[PDB]
Amino acid sequence: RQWALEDFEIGRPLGKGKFGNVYLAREKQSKFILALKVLFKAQLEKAGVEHQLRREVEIQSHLRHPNILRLYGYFHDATRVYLILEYAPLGTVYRELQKLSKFDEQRTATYITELANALSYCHSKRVIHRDIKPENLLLGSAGELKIADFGWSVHAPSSRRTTLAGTLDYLPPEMIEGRMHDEKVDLWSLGVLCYEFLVGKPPFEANTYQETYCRISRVEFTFPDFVTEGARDLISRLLKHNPSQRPMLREVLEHPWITANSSK
Amino acid sequence: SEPPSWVTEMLLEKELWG
Ligand SMILES: Nc1ncnc2c1ncn2[C@@H]1O[C@H](COP(=O)(O)OP(=O)(O)O)[C@@H](O)[C@H]1O
Ligand SMILES: *C(=O)CCNC(=O)[C@@H](*)CC(=O)O
Ligand SMILES: [Mg+2]
Ligand SMILES: [Mg+2]
Ligand code: NA
């Protein structure tokens, strides 16, 4: 109803956010296990990103899809805002990638399928996520991928967007150049993820931000030799400078590499 | 008001070595 901190038992930190930690929690009456995402009000106000939190709450609250992390509610006290989230027991894809170094083709294609299903649902609501990097992809109890952290998202029903957003390694040319952009930004990020999943490093990685920026703007990346011809085909189609040349999400879900390797 | 982290870092690089 009108949630408050006293309605939850608190446990260990699950991870560290920009504005506070995410804690394991339990709603007292139901005993149901959840996550409480904490944001410090003074931090938020100093950074001037209150609108990102408002969008996160306004957008993620209304999404209902098995591959999107649920946001159940929110509350605040004198110093903090709390978001009540679905708990993802198996952690981030980021940690899995660190542990395994790279994913085989079956695991990669299955994640891409789940990501494309989730993004299809988002884009049907005309929502753009814009920050789908591995530390924002969580894993449910059956190892299924869940898109989380909608603080960079936007509801873009008609107009194209111009906000500088997201995380450099995952952004397309039109977003790092601050040009107008649309839902095709998520298709580019999907190509970055597919490459990073198979290789272990995102394709434009460089030791300076300046070089990474230039590599992205000129689509300068190469494939290691173990990346198969089908994976190369998909990734190359997703990482097109021209947003309109990037495939539709239906075409990703139908790609012969995806259907031959995905278990989903 | 705060830009994405990468904007701040790339501006540092420019101020630091051009
Ligand atoms: N529902 C959740 N279940 C388990 N871990 C989570 C959950 N939400 C967040 N985390 C952990 O906390 C980290 C930060 O959460 P996130 O919502 O991405 O914060 P920020 O918006 O500051 O990036 C995630 O990378 C993950 O490690
Ligand atoms: C700051 O605006 C940096 C602009 N881009 C570069 O310096 C990239 C140059 C390159 O590596 O070719
Ligand atoms: Mg995050
Ligand atoms: Mg966030
Ligand atoms: Na890395």
Author numbering:
A (entry chain A): 126 to 389
B (entry chain B): 72 to 89
Task: Please give sentences taken from the publication describing this entry.
Specifically, positions 339 of Aurora-A and 85 of MYCN showed the appropriate orientation and distance for linking with a maleimide propionic acid attached to the Nɛ atom of a lysine side chain. As a consequence, the mutation K339C had to be introduced into Aurora-A to enable its ligation to the maleimide head group. From the resulting crystals, the structure could be determined to a resolution of 1.90 Å. For MYCN, only residues 72–89 were sufficiently defined in the electron-density maps; this sequence includes the C-terminal helix featuring residue 85, the residue at which the maleimide moiety was introduced. A Bicine molecule from the storage buffer is coordinated to the second (distal) Mg2+ ion, again exhibiting octahedral geometry, with the remaining coordination sites occupied by the side chain of Asp274 and an O atom of the distal phosphate group. The electron-density map clearly shows the modification of Cys339 of Aurora-A. Although the density between Cys339 and Lys85 of MYCN is not perfectly continuous, the propyl maleimide moiety can easily be modelled. In the ANX structure, the free acid function of the opened maleimide is stabilized by the positively charged side chain of Arg343.
Aurora-A is a serine/threonine kinase that belongs to the subfamily of Aurora kinases, which consists of Aurora-A, Aurora-B and Aurora-C. The three kinases are closely related; in their catalytic domains, Aurora-B and Aurora-C share 71% identity with Aurora-A. All three kinases play important but different roles during mitosis, which is presumably due to the fact that their N-terminal domains differ both in length and in sequence. The protein–protein complex formed between the kinase Aurora-A and the oncogenic transcription factor MYCN antagonizes proteasomal degradation of MYCN in neuroblastoma cells. Complex formation between Aurora-A and MYCN involving a site in MYCN in close proximity to the Thr58 degron abrogates FBW7 binding to the transcription factor and hence stabilizes MYCN levels. To overcome the challenges that a ternary system composed of Aurora-A, MYCN and a small molecule entails, a covalently cross-linked construct of the Aurora-A–MYCN complex was designed, expressed and characterized, thus enabling screening and design campaigns to identify selective binders.
